[PDB]
């Protein structure tokens, strides 16, 4: 069920980023782990590797961890690379990243973006918890810019 959000990025299962063939079909290289438990693959490079270390969950905190993983999603891009960014199921942690990368990526609002990523992978299901910190991560964003002089 593996999707294909933007050329360079795609959101996946652990069963996806971790069956050899499909990666090595797509060409996937990098890898976006957002999870505990969820292993490495072996054919995956460290240097092309990050973990965002979360629990799917309703008090689990995934905002701190945004921009840097936004960052690794532009690594791959700039080296002209796709990175997979997945968790468990695929419906939720790994989810909410690829809405943010969109939201700060595109300036889109957080309505917008989760229904660019949930157009393209219906089955995402992020819980409400990781869907207010896109909220927090949008308000956040829009101050930013207007330090940059853009009210």
Not at 60 to 67: F, H, I, N, T, Y
Not at 107 to 118: E, I, L, N, T
Request: charged letters at 20%; a positive charge.
């Amino acid at each position: 069920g593996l999707t294909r959000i933007l050329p360079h990025l795609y959101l996946g299962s652990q069963k996806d980023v971790l069956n050899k063939d499909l990666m090595t079909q797509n060409g996937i290289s990098y890898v976006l782990n957002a999870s505990n438990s969820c292993p490495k693959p072996d054919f995956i490079c460290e240097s092309r590797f990050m973990r965002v270390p979360i629990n799917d969950n309703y008090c689990e905190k995934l905002l701190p961890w945004l921009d840097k993983s936004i960052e690794f999603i532009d690594k791959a891009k700039l080296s002209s690379c796709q990175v997979i960014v997945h968790s468990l199921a695929g419906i939720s942690r790994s989810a909410t990243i690829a809405i943010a990368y969109i939201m700060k990526t595109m300036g889109m609002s957080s309505d917008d973006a989760y229904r660019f990523v949930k157009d393209r992978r219906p089955s995402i299901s992020p819980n409400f918890n990781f869907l207010g910190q896109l909220l927090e991560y949008e308000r956040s964003l829009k101050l930013l810019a207007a330090l940059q002089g853009d009210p």
